[PDB]
Amino acid sequence: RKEKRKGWNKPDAFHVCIVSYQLVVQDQHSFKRKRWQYMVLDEAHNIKNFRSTRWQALLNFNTQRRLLLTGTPLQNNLAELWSLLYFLMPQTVIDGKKVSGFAETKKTVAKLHQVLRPY
Amino acid sequence: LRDNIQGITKPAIRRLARRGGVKRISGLIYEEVRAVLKSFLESVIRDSVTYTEHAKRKTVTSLDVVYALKRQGRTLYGF
Amino acid sequence: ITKPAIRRLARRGGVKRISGLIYEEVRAVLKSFLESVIRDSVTYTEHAKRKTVTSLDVVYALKRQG
Amino acid sequence: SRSAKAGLTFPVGRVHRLLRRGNYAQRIGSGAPVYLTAVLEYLAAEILELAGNAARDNKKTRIIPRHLQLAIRNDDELNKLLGNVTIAQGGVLPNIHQNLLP
Amino acid sequence: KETYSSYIYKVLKQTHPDTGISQKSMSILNSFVNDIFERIATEASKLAAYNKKSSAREIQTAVRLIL
Amino acid sequence: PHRYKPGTVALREIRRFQKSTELLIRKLPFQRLVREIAQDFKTDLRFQSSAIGALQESVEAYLVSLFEDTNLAAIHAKRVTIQKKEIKLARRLRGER
Amino acid sequence: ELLIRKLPFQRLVREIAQDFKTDLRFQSSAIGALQESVEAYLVSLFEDTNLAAIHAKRVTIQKKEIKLARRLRGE
DNA sequence: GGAGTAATCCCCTTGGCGGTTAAAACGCGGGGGACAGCGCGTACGTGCGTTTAAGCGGTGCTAGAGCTGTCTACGACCAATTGAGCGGCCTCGGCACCGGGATTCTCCAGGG
DNA sequence: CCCTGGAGAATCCCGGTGCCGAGGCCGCTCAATTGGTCGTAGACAGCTCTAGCACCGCTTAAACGCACGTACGCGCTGTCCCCCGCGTTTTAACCGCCAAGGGGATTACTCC
Numbered sequence A: 001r002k003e004k005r006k007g008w009n010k011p012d013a014f015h016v017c018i019v020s021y022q023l024v025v026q027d028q029h030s031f032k033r034k035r036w037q038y039m040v041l042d043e044a045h046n047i048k049n050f051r052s053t054r055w056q057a058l059l060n061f062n063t064q065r066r067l068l069l070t071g072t073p074l075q076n077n078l079a080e081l082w083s084l085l086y087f088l089m090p091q092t093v094i095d096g097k098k099v100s101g102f103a104e105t106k107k108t109v110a111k112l113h114q115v116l117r118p119y
Numbered sequence B: 001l002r003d004n005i006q007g008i009t010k011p012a013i014r015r016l017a018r019r020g021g022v023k024r025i026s027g028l029i030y031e032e033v034r035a036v037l038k039s040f041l042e043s044v045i046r047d048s049v050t051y052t053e054h055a056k057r058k059t060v061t062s063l064d065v066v067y068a069l070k071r072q073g074r075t076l077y078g079f
Numbered sequence C: 001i002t003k004p005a006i007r008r009l010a011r012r013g014g015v016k017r018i019s020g021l022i023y024e025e026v027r028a029v030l031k032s033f034l035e036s037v038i039r040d041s042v043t044y045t046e047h048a049k050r051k052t053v054t055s056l057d058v059v060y061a062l063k064r065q066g
Numbered sequence D: 001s002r003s004a005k006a007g008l009t010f011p012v013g014r015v016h017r018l019l020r021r022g023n024y025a026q027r028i029g030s031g032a033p034v035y036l037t038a039v040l041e042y043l044a045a046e047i048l049e050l051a052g053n054a055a056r057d058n059k060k061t062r063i064i065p066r067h068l069q070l071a072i073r074n075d076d077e078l079n080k081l082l083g084n085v086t087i088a089q090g091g092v093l094p095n096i097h098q099n100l101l102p
Numbered sequence E: 001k002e003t004y005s006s007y008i009y010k011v012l013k014q015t016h017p018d019t020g021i022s023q024k025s026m027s028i029l030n031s032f033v034n035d036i037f038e039r040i041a042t043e044a045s046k047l048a049a050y051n052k053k054s055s056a057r058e059i060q061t062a063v064r065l066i067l
Numbered sequence F: 001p002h003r004y005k006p007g008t009v010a011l012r013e014i015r016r017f018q019k020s021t022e023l024l025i026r027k028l029p030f031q032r033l034v035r036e037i038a039q040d041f042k043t044d045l046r047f048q049s050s051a052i053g054a055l056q057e058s059v060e061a062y063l064v065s066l067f068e069d070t071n072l073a074a075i076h077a078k079r080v081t082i083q084k085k086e087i088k089l090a091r092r093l094r095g096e097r
Numbered sequence G: 001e002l003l004i005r006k007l008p009f010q011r012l013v014r015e016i017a018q019d020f021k022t023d024l025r026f027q028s029s030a031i032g033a034l035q036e037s038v039e040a041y042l043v044s045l046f047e048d049t050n051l052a053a054i055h056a057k058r059v060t061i062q063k064k065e066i067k068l069a070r071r072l073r074g075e
Numbered sequence H: 001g002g003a004g005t006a007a008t009c010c011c012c013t014t015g016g017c018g019g020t021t022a023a024a025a026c027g028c029g030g031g032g033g034a035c036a037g038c039g040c041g042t043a044c045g046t047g048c049g050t051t052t053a054a055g056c057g058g059t060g061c062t063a064g065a066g067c068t069g070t071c072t073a074c075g076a077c078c079a080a081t082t083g084a085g086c087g088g089c090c091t092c093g094g095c096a097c098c099g100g101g102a103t104t105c106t107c108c109a110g111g112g
Numbered sequence I: 001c002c003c004t005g006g007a008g009a010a011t012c013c014c015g016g017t018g019c020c021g022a023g024g025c026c027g028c029t030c031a032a033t034t035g036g037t038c039g040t041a042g043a044c045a046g047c048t049c050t051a052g053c054a055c056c057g058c059t060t061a062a063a064c065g066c067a068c069g070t071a072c073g074c075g076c077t078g079t080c081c082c083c084c085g086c087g088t089t090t091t092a093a094c095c096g097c098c099a100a101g102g103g104g105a106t107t108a109c110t111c112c
């Protein structure tokens, strides 16, 4: 991949780096050198691993416009369901038990739908 | 689970010659320089395996490459 | 070195056909190498707390580079 | 700071411990344990000036390993010091022979 | 953890106030500075053992001969 | 068919290949040669990450320096390009053993 | 011994080294070692240039033959 | 009431594939690189008539050299306090190779 | 044949405009101070002395021409070779994707 890394840094020699989960995970040091306008994932149900090093790779990516393309958000385990919002923009408080979890789940799923509705 | 070489390019060996100051070629340019590579590397690894078998111990962090190649006769910087 | 010493060197000298060329060449780096080695000796003997060159302070003169 | 005795600014504490316990001399007796840091400051300053000059040019502001390789091959004192070293992440000195050239 | 970088930028401010450099140059600085330290320590080790006088002149001779 | 004199287009090849930080060695099989060398006698290396780049660049330094020395010995003879005999001259005088 | 006699090389060494430090002197030793080392380097260069001439298809070495002999021997 | 058995976390490998580009090679044209024998002469070849120096050996101590009393000149412990830059973050200036625009690099078949 | 009208190609002056980027800034914390203790490297006075340098006095060892004289240095000249030019194609490493057991650690449960 270095043979096409010479005239590669700045210009639209690639209009988009189609960088799968392959190069993000193992080269977070190398992927900290050039600007990236967009940020997406595909079917983020399997990326529920918040403590994965890909999270460290993509967290420092100071991107002006993130995005997420999840095939199907789950129906239980509120943590992985809010993980989509957390990947989209880490601006919400870490605590999520105030919405539901300990204090009858019809209101819980209704609140889940409500907090999802704008996003 | 082992892999082996196939011939070391017409093109990339040609660029090796290009940065070596070569424009045309003879019949003795591609293959033999890789033979010198193999001989020098086999000598340096012969010394290394002698070192690591006389005392029967492993190696240490990436600082070995600069010291071993300096004794060999061509070392490197960069980090 | 003079003409006869170079003549014997050329007598060794690859069937003597290299005489004139070595006559012209081998004297160019003679003084250069001599100056280099004597400068190295002076630097080695600089730290000797003595006043003259002694073999005691020049044992490991080229220890850095062999 | 613990290094401003003679215009130096590199850390002294761990350096004091290492130079005092260098395991090469029995005792540095009056004595320049800070002279290693002195030459360290000297090399740091020269690298600063050279790297600033190199980065500021080429219509850029960053040091590509090409520029550092060029700087390393540029100096003569460094060549005499250890002339059997090479710089990575770059290329060899460009060359073409007039006999090679048409 | 410990960084010479702050002191290096202090010296830069002594030289140039608003210049930016690269991290690879910093790593090469680390490598070459440390190997200079190792060589300068190695050179001036047994010089005090050359004669029965075992300081500053050891490292002075080291820098005199390596340069 | 704009076919010009070889050597001058080879000259533009030299100019392109001797300008930037381009990795002229299309050489992951160089890495496989290094792997065959390393695992030839021992195993369980467990080395660093970017050490392959450093060892390969040292390989480049050795081989390319051999290339320039060979070309100098070649223009020393009446043959401009790389010849095996020039490489023997460049390696034997280095103290190959 | 000294194919170039001891007195010529001694005169040359003293003349060259008089400029470094005043009143420089040598003991009974360090007289014939310098010429021996110089001749050892010369013989090594001779072997290298002889190999180069063997390649060069001419027994006659030249300026460039000795240049290649000296340059590629290590320095 | 801390450890013995053993149920738990778990993550990391032993290994085999998607996706993948470079890695080495073909491949045709030719023209510059491949390597040398001769021309002849210049490029060395050489061995005995003709001398300064080199490596010395005949006194007397003769510039640097190893030399033993008894020390002058200093460089490294611990114990309560404290400041340098580190423990962690990412701020505002200035980035970073092919495009707007194309004259360069290189050869060739007619003007001439 | 020279000289050239015309043909081929290809990346240098400054950005893409959103982020790389280096070590200032929050102050605290851990080996530096100074409170006393402590005996070791460096060395001043000390005495002729190692082998032979100032004379004299050297014997030939390299060091110097001559009289020709007798072959090879570099390119003409020769085939010859010959392998890139750069497009095109097929061997060819790295990094996620999979679903499991080992097993070090670690405590649920317990027990003598």
Ligand code: BEF
Pocket (backbone or CB within 6 Å): A042, A043, A070, A071, A072
């Ligand atoms: F992108 Be998928 F198939 F949810």
